[PDB]
């Protein structure tokens, strides 16, 4: 579908730029963590933990597959 | 460069997922049902929990996604921005 293509078309230029930009990592990883600032008080902190202990094996499981089986796994493909 | 393409791509995405949750009766349906599925890769006492998390929160996550323009999704999601 169109939202397929889309998708591969945003993970193949997420992979893009994971390899390119060495700076591109962090600074998604740390907008997601200042968006677990929405939570309550006590619970913004193990927001910022799952980010902190789950960003990596999101990150190296992304590269380490084909953008279609990204958005198979996600829902947006088939 | 290739983050700005990152952005793009997200607005392009988040505009098409709104187009296609107001154009079709059956996305919202099949895209929770493959999210659900997708929680059984954890632990079996979990992935229920997993799966009732998507089933409680699924309303507030496509109505606040609704009442949103694409640019401020993909800012909230960091690929924007």
Same mark, same amino acid.
């Given at each position: 579908?169109?939202?397929?293509?889309?998708?591969?078309?945003?993970?193949?230029?997420?992979?893009?730029?994971?390899?390119?930009?060495?700076?591109?990592?962090?600074?998604?990883?740390?907008?997601? $963590? +200042?968006? !677990?600032?929405?939570? %309550?008080?006590?619970?913004?902190?193990?927001?910022?933990?799952?980010?902190?202990?789950?960003?990596?094996?999101?990150?190296?499981?992304?590269?380490?597959?084909?953008? $279609? +089986?990204? !958005?198979?796994?996600? %829902?947006?493909?088939?």
């Amino acid at each position: 579908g169109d939202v397929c293509q889309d998708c591969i078309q945003m993970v193949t230029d997420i992979q893009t730029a994971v390899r390119t930009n060495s700076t591109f990592v962090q600074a998604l990883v740390e907008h997601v $963590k +200042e968006e !677990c600032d929405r939570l %309550g008080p006590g619970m913004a902190d193990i927001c910022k933990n799952y980010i902190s202990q789950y960003s990596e094996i999101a990150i190296q499981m992304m590269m380490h597959m084909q953008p $279609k +089986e990204i !958005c198979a796994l996600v %829902g947006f493909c088939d």
